[PDB]
């Protein structure tokens, strides 16, 4: 299909603090996915990272391997360093018959620290925008090469999180350099989905269906809590429930519109103890599905 429809296993066993959902085992999680329906998974710290074994567990169940997570380090190391680091990550896409590698600056990210709380995140200087930039490009550009599109997951705590900090960093990167949308990530930083797809839907390679809780958002500021403290309390949730703030429809409009192709990931981390993710992954698919038809973006 044009539109596929994949799930992240953070909503089961977390991946910045791997005592969340520890007790849930791989085939646990697998299983989950499977039977709720969804045409692939994203990359988890419990999975298999050889191909043979990664396909053991992937094809029984019919699922895809949609991306992995890739940390980057351009703010400390050279761009030759970093195409180095990625080619492991690059070499299991390509034999998964992946199409897209998801990567973030992580060198001096906060998110997975409990003790710094969000308004501590860093920010990158101005003068260093261009050479940051410069690099994403390059390494854009050699996992194109090779056949994978680089896609870039702003994300809270690190140095691409606000709406004007997404501008900057498509302005100063492409042709290759493509942005994941993380309608999450994109409403917590503060930010509208809707207006940055708005803007950068051509760029946008790779779609994170992640929906946010205001009110827990808002004790995130307040009480000036971490990233994670705010995950355990629920910051993010599904498409479809009732408690979120996130507005799905207009974005995957656009998205319509302008004809996007790939994946649609619903990716919400919460404690799984309280937030059952069977539960709620089922309710984030079917959701996502009746969004994606009411957009016009799934035609089936
Ligand atoms: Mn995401």
Redesign the pocket.
């Known amino acids: 299909h044009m539109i596929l429809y994949g799930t ?1 296993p953070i909503a089961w066993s977390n991946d910045d603090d791997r005592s969340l959902g520890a007790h849930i085992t791989l085939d646990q999680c697998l299983d989950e996915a499977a039977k709720i329906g969804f045409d692939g998974i994203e990359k988890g710290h419990k999975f298999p990272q050889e191909a043979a074994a990664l396909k053991a567990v992937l094809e029984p169940r019919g699922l895809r391997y949609v991306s992995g997570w890739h940390s980057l380090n351009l703010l400390v190391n050279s761009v030759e360093e970093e195409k180095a680091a990625m080619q492991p990550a690059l070499d299991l896409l390509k034999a998964m018959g992946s199409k897209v590698i ?1 990567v973030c600056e992580t060198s001096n990210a906060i998110h997975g620290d409990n003790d710094k709380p969000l308004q501590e995140r860093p920010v990158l200087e101005d003068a260093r925008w261009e050479a940051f930039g410069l690099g994403v490009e390059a390494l854009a550009a050699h996992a194109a090469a090779q056949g994978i599109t680089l896609v870039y ?1 702003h ?1 809270m705590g690190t140095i691409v999180e606000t709406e004007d900090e997404i501008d900057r960093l498509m302005r100063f990167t492409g042709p290759h350099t493509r942005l ?1 949308l ?1 309608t ?2 994109c409403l917590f930083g503060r930010g509208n989905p809707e207006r940055v797809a708005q803007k950068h839907i051509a760029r946008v390679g790779h779609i ?1 269906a ?1 929906n946010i809780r205001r009110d827990i958002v808002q004790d995130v500021r307040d009480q000036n809590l971490s990233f994670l403290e705010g995950v355990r309390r629920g910051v993010f949730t599904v498409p479809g429930d009732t408690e979120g703030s996130v507005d799905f429809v207009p974005v995957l409009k656009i998205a319509a519109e302008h004809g996007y192709q790939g994946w649609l ?1 619903i ?1 919400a981390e919460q404690d799984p103890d309280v937030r059952n993710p069977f539960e709620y992954q089922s309710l984030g698919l079917k959701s996502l599905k009746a969004f994606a038809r009411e957009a016009g973006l799934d035609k089936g």
Do not use: M, P, Q, S
């Open positions: 992240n998801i997951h994300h994941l993380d999450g990530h994170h992640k990931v990716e």
